Write a protein that binds this ligand. Structure first.
Ligand SMILES: O=c1ccn([C@@H]2O[C@H](COP(=O)(O)OP(=O)(O)O)[C@@H](O)[C@H]2O)c(=O)[nH]1
Length: 397
């Protein structure tokens, strides 16, 4: 079948969608993936028709974020529809957090599926998990009346079916694939059968082979990454250089793309410091993961039964951090308590710790049991089959 896929601008969005595209393609499907230019190689790598839309990141108040996401919906929906209108697609997949995806699905009159790369969210989750506060009342919010104008226009002119603010950021398809298990998902019981909890979507990405695996293959490996988004971090990597310099093995520091490695302090002789690592392959070989608590890093780590130390900074990280504390699989350091000493003690406590390893194994196994990129494909293709046979029953007119 012909599949329109519309991604969201961020690596933690794109990465889990790779497994599902790769599973769908190896089953006969031709895919057209829309993303921002940054992540092209990640899609070209799969041998999948790549296409672009304006990166709206390069251009925290709740009502402003609603309006930015509606401006972008309108631009993406217009741009993408202009290009796809004459093409023959059988269904659309899109990032749960990209409303334009649901709008494209409505303009093509096709079956659609959302991929949720965070925990599943309903009205019982705080705005703060999507990285927004309100100072006081919604009325006195600066973009309040703008939100009411744009939502209204997108409903009338774009079939955006926005009944509620949260519908801007949580765009349910006919199904919502969620990349966690009901086990790990807080308030799992509040999500019906249209939420398919498939756990993490793990498969070889391309770019991996450059890293020297032979240096870490028969060694203890401490892996550290604060993600792909939380910079302001040169301070923290400097602290990692001092805390871990006498580690008895290899320390793999992924510092991200906005900090030159020469801008840090002296690298000890036992460190491999890169802007980007093949995280899946590093986790395969890692004893311990010091992570920011990003949904994907956290659930990639547990998938490899890696005990964690989680230093959460923003967005959903507090909620995922707390889920790691809850299931026994790791230990959280609050930013306010972060110090070289407490970083060193926390790593020494969790390294090789029988109790953290057991609990990491349990939740790791809950997450694998959810069926992964494979389950995402069975569930989607089966929904498509039923709606095709349903709609293909135009043998009355
Ligand atoms: O050096 C790195 C750093 C990050 N990642 C990937 O980037 C994504 C980060 O998503 P997460 O939800 O953990 O954090 P965010 O960066 O979105 O805060 C994950 O799939 C990681 O495997 C990677 O491959 N190599």
């Amino acid at each position: 079948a012909n599949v329109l896929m519309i991604g969201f601008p961020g690596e933690g969005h794109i990465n889990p969608s790779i497994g599902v595209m790769k599973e769908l393609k190896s089953r006969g499907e031709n895919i057209t993936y829309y993303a921002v230019k940054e992540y092209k190689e990640k899609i070209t790598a799969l041998d999948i028709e790549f296409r672009e839309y304006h990166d709206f990141r390069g251009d925290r108040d709740f009502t402003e974020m609603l309006c930015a996401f509606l401006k972008a919906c309108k631009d993406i929906a217009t741009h993408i529809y202009e290009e796809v209108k004459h093409e023959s697609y059988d269904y659309v997949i899109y990032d749960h957090h990209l409303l334009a995806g649901k709008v494209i699905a409505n303009m093509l009159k096709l079956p659609r599926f959302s991929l949720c790369t965070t925990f599943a969210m309903n009205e019982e989750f705080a705005k703060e998990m999507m990285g927004a506060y309100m100072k006081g009342s919604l009325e006195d919010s600066p973009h309040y009346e703008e939100y009411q104008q744009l939502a209204e226009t997108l409903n009338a002119d774009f079939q955006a079916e926005i009944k509620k603010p949260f519908d801007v950021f949580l765009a349910d398809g006919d199904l919502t694939i969620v990349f966690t298990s009901r086990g790990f998902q807080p308030l799992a019981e509040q999500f019906g059968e249209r939420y398919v909890f498939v756990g993490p979507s793990i498969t070889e990405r391309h770019g991996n082979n450059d890293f020297p695996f032979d240096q870490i293959d028969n060694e203890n490996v401490l892996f550290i990454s604060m993600g792909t988004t939380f910079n302001n971090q040169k301070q923290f990597f400097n602290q990692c250089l001092e805390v871990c310099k006498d580690f008895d093995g290899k320390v793999v520091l992924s510092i991200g793309k906005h900090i030159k490695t020469s801008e840090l302090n002296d690298i000890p002789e036992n460190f491999i410091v890169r802007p980007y690592v093949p995280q899946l392959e590093i986790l395969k070989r890692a004893s311990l993961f010091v992570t920011h608590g990003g949904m994907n890093s956290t659930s990639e780590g547990l998938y490899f039964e890696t005990p964690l130390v989680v230093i959460p900074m923003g967005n959903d990280q507090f909620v995922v951090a707390d889920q790691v504390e809850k299931v026994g699989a790791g230990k959280v350091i609050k930013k306010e308590e972060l110090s070289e000493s407490l970083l060193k003690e926390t790593i020494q406590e969790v390294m090789n710790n029988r109790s953290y390893k057991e609990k990491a194994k349990e939740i790791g196994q809950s997450l694998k049991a959810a069926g992964g990129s494979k389950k995402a494909a069975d569930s989607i293709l089966e929904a498509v089959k039923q709606k095709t046979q349903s709609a293909n029953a135009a043998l009355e007119h």
